[PDB]
Amino acid sequence: FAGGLTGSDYGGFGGKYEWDPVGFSTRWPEHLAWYREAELKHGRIAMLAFAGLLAPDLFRLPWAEFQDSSLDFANAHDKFVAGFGPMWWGFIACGGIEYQRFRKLGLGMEGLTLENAGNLGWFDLPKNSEERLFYETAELKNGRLAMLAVSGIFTAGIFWDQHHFPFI
Amino acid sequence: KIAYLQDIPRTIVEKDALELILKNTPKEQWENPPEDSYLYTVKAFAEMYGPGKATKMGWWDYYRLKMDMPDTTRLSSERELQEIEEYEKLMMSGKVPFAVPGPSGYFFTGFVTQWKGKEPFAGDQVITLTENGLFAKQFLSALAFYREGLKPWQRGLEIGMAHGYFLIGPFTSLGPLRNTPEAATVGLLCGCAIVGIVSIGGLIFGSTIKPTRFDKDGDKPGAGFIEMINWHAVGGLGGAGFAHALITVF
Amino acid sequence: REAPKVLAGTGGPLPESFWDPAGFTNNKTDEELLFYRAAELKHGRIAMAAVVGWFTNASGFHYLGDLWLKKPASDNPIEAFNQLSLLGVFQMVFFIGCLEWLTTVPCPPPKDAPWDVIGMSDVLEEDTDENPMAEYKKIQMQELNNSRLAMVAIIGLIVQATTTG
Amino acid sequence: ELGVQAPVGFWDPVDGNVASFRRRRTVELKHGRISMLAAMGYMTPEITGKFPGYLSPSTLLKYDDIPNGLGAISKVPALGWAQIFVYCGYAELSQDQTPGSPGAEGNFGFKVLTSSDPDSLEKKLASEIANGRLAMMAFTGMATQDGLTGSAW
Amino acid sequence: FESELGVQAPTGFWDPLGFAKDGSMKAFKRRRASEIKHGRIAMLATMGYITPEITGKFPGYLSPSTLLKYDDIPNGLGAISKVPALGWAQIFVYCGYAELSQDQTPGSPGAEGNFGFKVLTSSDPDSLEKKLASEIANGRLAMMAFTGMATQDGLTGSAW
Ligand code: CLA
Ligand code: CLA
Ligand code: KC1
Ligand SMILES: CC1=C(/C=C/C(C)=C/C=C/C(C)=C/C=C/C=C(C)/C=C/C=C(C)/C=C/C2=C(C)CCCC2(C)C)C(C)(C)CCC1
């Protein structure tokens, strides 16, 4: 199921889950590299997003334009981008990192396969070979959860007008 | 293999859809699909359009063909075919997947009650829970009419006590004299009258039909039934009187 | 397990997980384990009706008891029990006493399945292989799992009512 | 084997068997885990503050109003500690010692030992139990401090 | 059954009401398990009244939220309404486990009073019957002592 990708296996009371109840993997097997790459990159950003909304509430960056109150998660976007602003500082940074991914897998991402997907090569904590399998599932399980978490955060916080960690 | 099922263009019908058709269609019908069967249209067209044949169609002809073929969703899958092939097997084997009527419909209870009785051709031996279950059998057998070891007068006495005790109520309440100071002796008299009337009917039955299932060996035919009916009359009197006594005292 | 195999594949969170985190079943004989289940199902079946009876009475539907007391009884089922006329309670006990007598002495359930108070075992199959039937084990799970939930649910209702209203 | 340590031997001036030691080992590890959770658990309402917040039952947006080492109560978070007590039982009745075939193994749900860093047996199994013993004395000593010698720090 | 740990000396097989003319062999152990459990509770119960009388009430707070210095709770009946229902629930829970532990089901090692305390395990010096019989005999004394103590605390009004 989905090549040798680690989304299933070590996945709860059952050893393997293999949740693909639309067949987006069997129907499009050439994109399992793309799907993993997207699934992982979604998880990492969502995890930074959720851990994002909380930390500005305590510390603020020394940019001295972000050093202002009332910049909650419903107005920080439309406020910083100016007539340019901090949001472009972040976007340029994300361009620098994303350009690195292009070099490793070629321009058309031809080198992207079902084993190198979502593997930028930053190996500091992991050890051994089975832990990498265990950590890869621990990555996704956290990542998939935060993707739904920040989804609930953004919708509930702006609908019910919470804008803070309880988001209720 | 079959000629027209080989090298059929995907444009005529897709591979998975064709396999689903072949699975749904019985094996004996592949060679010559009957008529009005999607496989019949597949044969009638794949023998006209293909690699060695007409490779093009008018847009309207292809449009009509695409509306004659299955759309990959109107065909039963393997599990559904298994459901049917096993449900029919159960039904023909004399076992019924037990279901219970509900709000215009029935819920399947997930139980296989063996349906045909010991005499499979007998219509009244089809065993059901309410008559052939363990509780139902033991309840019917333990009734006064059927209980083992009871003398006929005992069955009559028990049935009569039940009837006489019950029959007082409908008269002493909501009766013609329901609001009179007595209002219960009238009910007692009416209940005793009903008991006597049904006892007379039972005597008619025992002197005309003459059931012999309660007679002991070597006795006047129907004597057991007559004794049961007489003691039903006695028990009805007793039960009516006891109900009246309870009503008056309490 | 050996003897707990007679009540195997019928409990736990998932259907085939013998939970017993107290050893209450080990060293116990097959008949004792069957009798323990007969106690479990009987408690659960009453608990299911108890919870349903609690809710149809805590919402405002106590007709027999409003028409017998000639006044709307309190919605709180514990307090409505006191208001219910003593004739009603005694008849309620007697009816259950007749039912308990009826099941035990005249129409006893079997000794291999002491919970078959209706006695389906004489018309049931329970050992065939059909899919659109023979799911009797699954419906045994739904009875047990629902009943177990009802047992802790009704106790919660009584404990909370008798304490925090 | 296992929890036999280095500075002392079997330290049994009183079990001393196989089956009885196994049950005692389960108690030992179990008490070790709680103390380590409690010891680091007690230091946190200290520096980093009484971290909690958000909409809680009768404690909406409660900044962990259960103060002091004992926690007190007064419908402040300590009543919510009963929920900790209840859910602690759920793990104690699902992932428990009756199906815990070794001393106090819960099958390693987190798989931290599958090369993530911990290892099977050897020092790690000995380090867990030894650390638990230190924390159990530390938690008890911390209990004495809160009672009659002020607060933790 | 006439040769178990219960027959001490001052009375023989003391069954005046004839619970043993029909007492089945397992019924003895069941009733013995009842006797051992009753006696051990009574010993704990007795200590629980005579010890707070001479030794003062617990130096502490009992309930850190509802100001129970152990002194507002009297030693004896009526303390049931003074001790919190949760301190009552928590002792109920603790006693709840002590039986939902290693089982005391009929035939189990817990069904003859054996649970695994072994505070006094003499090296079989013909004293296993001594310690067993002493525990049963003291439990019988403790039960009688408690019921008198309960009547002492009730009929007089308080304590003794
Ligand atoms: C009348 C109560 C009762 C009885 C007799 C049984 C009987 C049985 N259950 Mg069971 N169960 C019950 C209630 C009951 N259950 C409830 C309410 C739940 C929900 C949590 C469960 C959940 C459950 C699971 C998940 C499983 C069983 C299983 C079993 C079988 C194995 C024997 C066993 O576990 O111990 C039998 C003996 C007892 C249960 C003793 C009763 C409890 C004692 C008296 C102490 C409890 C007191 C309690 C702490 C205080 C009361 C208030 C409380 C609500 C807070 C057996 C047939 C297993 C099985 O058959 O699976 C194959 C299994 O896996 N049960
Ligand atoms: C929970 C109480 C309890 C129980 C279950 C037992 C059980 C047993 N005892 Mg025992 N015993 C007890 C209390 C108890 N004892 C007390 C308090 C004493 C001290 C007087 C003794 C003294 C004693 C001796 C000397 C011997 C036994 C023996 C036995 C065993 C066989 C006799 C028998 O069947 O007794 C069954 C016991 C009962 C059924 C208890 C019923 C108690 C009734 C209902 C009330 C008695 C009056 C009571 C004090 C009234 C209190 C007043 C209150 C209402 C205000 C059996 C295991 C014999 C033995 O081991 O043989 C091998 C033996 O030799 N016991
Ligand atoms: C109501 C919404 C809902 C939620 C919120 C939810 C949540 C989770 N499900 Mg789930 N689920 C359904 C619905 C929901 N599931 C339904 C309708 C079915 C029947 C088809 C079903 C079945 C399975 C199976 C077979 C598995 C499973 C899993 C997990 C899992 C992972 C936890 C962990 O591994 O980190 C989490 C968080 C795996 C498992 O581990 O369960 C613990 C797995 O094997 N689920
Ligand atoms: C509603 C209900 C039901 C039903 C029920 C029923 C059906 C009942 C019936 C009941 C009845 C129906 C009862 C009856 C009873 C009776 C009695 C109790 C009687 C008694 C009698 C007597 C006692 C008599 C005596 C005598 C004689 C014998 C003769 C001489 C004189 C004298 C009087 C001595 C069901 C379950 C379905 C369900 C729901 C509920």
Task: Count Cβ atoms within 10 A of the Cβ of residue A86 and give its class: 0-12 exposed, 13-18 middle, 19 or more buried.
Answer: middle
What span, in angstroms and rounded, lies between the C-alpha atoms of E4 and D86?
43
User: For residue B108, which phi and psi values (nearest 5 degrees)?
Assistant: -75, 125
Among B89, B92, B38, which residue's Cα sits nearest to residue B67? B38
Alpha helices (H) in chain D, listed in sequence order:
19-43, 78-94, 122-148
Q: Which sign does the torsion angle of CA A152, A155, A159, A163 carry?
A: positive
Q: For residue D70, what is the nearest residue in chain E, using CA coordinates?
A: E64
Contact B232, B160 (CB under 8 A): yes
Residues of D in contact with E64 (CB under 8 A): 70-73
Q: For residue D54, what is the nearest residue in chain A, using CA coordinates?
A: A166
Query: What does the DSSP assignment read for B97-127?
Result: EEEEEETTEEEEEEEEEE-S-SSTT-SS---
Contact B199, B236 (CB under 8 A): yes
The residue whose CA has the least distance to atom 59 of ligand 1 is: C11
Reading the block at residue D75, the tokens are 């419908």
Report CA(E152)–ligand 2 centroid distance (Å).
Answer: 22
Reading the block at residue C97, the tokens are 């006493």
Report CA(B163)–ligand 4 centroid distance (Å).
Answer: 7
Decide: E and B in contact? Rule: 3+ Cβ pairs under 8 Å: no
Residues of C in contact with B90 (CB under 8 A): 128, 130, 132-133
Alpha helices (H) in B25-175, listed in sequence order:
38-46, 59-66, 78-92, 129-132, 134-141, 152-167, 169-172
Atom of ligand 4 nearest to the CA of B242: 33
Cβ(B153) – ligand 4 distance below 6 Å: no
Q: Which sign does the torsion angle of CA D18, D20, D23, D27 carry?
A: negative
Contact A168, D54 (CB under 8 A): yes
Task: Count Cβ atoms within 10 A of the Cβ of residue B220 and give its class: 0-12 exposed, 13-18 middle, 19 or more buried.
Answer: exposed
Three-state SS for B54?
Answer: strand
Ligand nearest to the CA of C1: 1
Contact C6, C33 (CB under 8 A): yes
What span, in angstroms and rounded, lies between the C-alpha atoms of B170 and B240?
12
Reading the block at residue A6, the tokens are 């680690």
Residues of C in contact with D94 (CB under 8 A): 13
Reading the block at residue D81, the tokens are 């500690």
Report CA(A143)–ligand 3 centroid distance (Å).
Answer: 16
Q: For residue D90, what is the nearest residue in chain C, using CA coordinates?
A: C21
Cβ–Cβ of D98/C13 closer than 8 Å?
A: no
Q: For residue C14, what is the nearest residue in chain D, using CA coordinates?
A: D94
For residue A65, give every residue at least 6 positions away whose Cβ sits within 8 Å of its Cβ, in sequence order, or none. Answer: A80, A85, A86
B112 forms beta bridges with B97
Angle of the E128-151 helix axis to the E25-54 helix axis, nearest 10 = 60
In angstroms, what separates the C-alpha of D148 from chain A's closest C-alpha? 36
Three-state SS for A51?
Answer: helix
Contact B93, C121 (CB under 8 A): no
What span, in angstroms and rounded, lies between the C-alpha atoms of B24 and C17?
39
Residues of A in contact with D115 (CB under 8 A): 127-131, 134
User: For residue B217, which phi and psi values (nearest 5 degrees)?
Assistant: -60, 140
What span, in angstroms and rounded, lies between the C-alpha atoms of C50 and C150?
8
Cα dist. A65→A51, A164, B100, E46 in Å?
21, 21, 71, 75
Ligand nearest to the CA of E40: 2
Cα dist. B182→B167, B245, B250 in Å?
17, 12, 14
Cβ(E148) – ligand 2 distance below 6 Å: no
Nearest to C132 among B90, B135, B137 (CB): B90
H/E stretch holding B95 reads: strand B95-102
Angle at alpha carbon of residue E116, lines to E115 and E119, rounded to 5°: 125
B113 forms beta bridges with B96, C124
Cβ(E13) – ligand 2 distance below 6 Å: yes
Query: What does the DSSP assignment read for chain C?
Result: --GGGGGTTSBSSSTB----TT-SSTT--HHHHHHHHHHHHHHHHHHHHHHHHHHHHHTT--HHHHTTTTS---SSHHHHHHHS-HHHHHHHHHHHHHHHHHHHTTSPPPSSSTT-SS-GGGTB-SS---SSS-THHHHHHHHHHHHHHHHHHHHHHHHHHHS--
Residues of E in contact with C163 (CB under 8 A): 85
Cα dist. D74→C164, D92, E70 in Å?
16, 27, 19
From which experimental method does this structure derive? cryo-EM
Long-range contacts from B241-246, C-beta under 8 angstroms, 24+ separation? B241/B164, B241/B188, B242/B161, B242/B164, B242/B165, B243/B164, B243/B165, B243/B166, B243/B168, B243/B169, B243/B188, B243/B191, B244/B168, B244/B172, B244/B184, B244/B185, B244/B187, B244/B188
Atom of ligand 1 nearest to the CA of C24: 35
What span, in angstroms and rounded, lies between the C-alpha atoms of B144 and C106?
12
What span, in angstroms and rounded, lies between the C-alpha atoms of D22 and D27?
9
Ligand nearest to the CA of B244: 4
For residue C53, give every residue at least 6 positions away whose Cβ sits within 8 Å of its Cβ, in sequence order, or none. Answer: C77
Residues within a 6 A CB radius of ligand 1: C 7-8, 10-12, 17-20, 24-25, 36-37, 39-40, 43, 148, 151-152, 155; E 96, 100
Angle at alpha carbon of residue D101, lines to D99 and D103, rounded to 5°: 115
Q: In this structure, which amino acid lies at residue E88? A: W
Which bin fits B126, alpha (ψ -120 to 50), beta or left (φ > 0)? Answer: beta
Cβ–Cβ of D94/C23 closer than 8 Å?
A: no
Reading the block at residue B113, the tokens are 């009650």
H/E stretch holding B96 reads: strand B95-102
What span, in angstroms and rounded, lies between the C-alpha atoms of E89 and E44?
18
Positions of chain breaks in chain D, given as the residue before each break (C to N > 2.5 Å): 14
C16 forms beta bridges with C11
User: For residue D16, which phi and psi values (nearest 5 degrees)?
Assistant: 100, 45
Among A26, C134, C128, C132, which residue's Cα sits nearest to residue B80? C132
Task: Count Cβ atoms within 10 A of the Cβ of residue B148 and give its class: 0-12 exposed, 13-18 middle, 19 or more buried.
Answer: exposed
The residue whose CA has the least distance to atom 14 of ligand 4 is: B162
Positions of chain breaks in chain A, given as the residue before each break (C to N > 2.5 Å): 83
Atom of ligand 4 nearest to the CA of B241: 33
Task: Count Cβ atoms within 10 A of the Cβ of residue B42 and give its class: 0-12 exposed, 13-18 middle, 19 or more buried.
Answer: buried
Q: Which sign does the torsion angle of CA C147, C151, C152, C156 carry?
A: positive
In angstroms, what separates the C-alpha of D29 from chain E's closest C-alpha? 18
Measure the N-to-C terminal CA separation of chain D; round to a whole number of Å.
38
What span, in angstroms and rounded, lies between the C-alpha atoms of C128 and B111?
10
Cβ–Cβ of B134/C109 closer than 8 Å?
A: yes
Q: In this structure, which amino acid lies at residue D57? A: P
Among D61, B91, B209, which residue's Cα sits nearest to residue A167? D61
Ligand nearest to the CA of C152: 1
Identify the DSSP state of A138: H
Cβ(E24) – ligand 2 distance below 6 Å: no
Report CA(E143)–ligand 2 centroid distance (Å).
Answer: 10
Q: Which of D59, D62, D112, D115 to probe the A interface (max A CBs under 10 A)?
A: D115
Residues of C in contact with E102 (CB under 8 A): 23
Cβ(E112) – ligand 2 distance below 6 Å: no
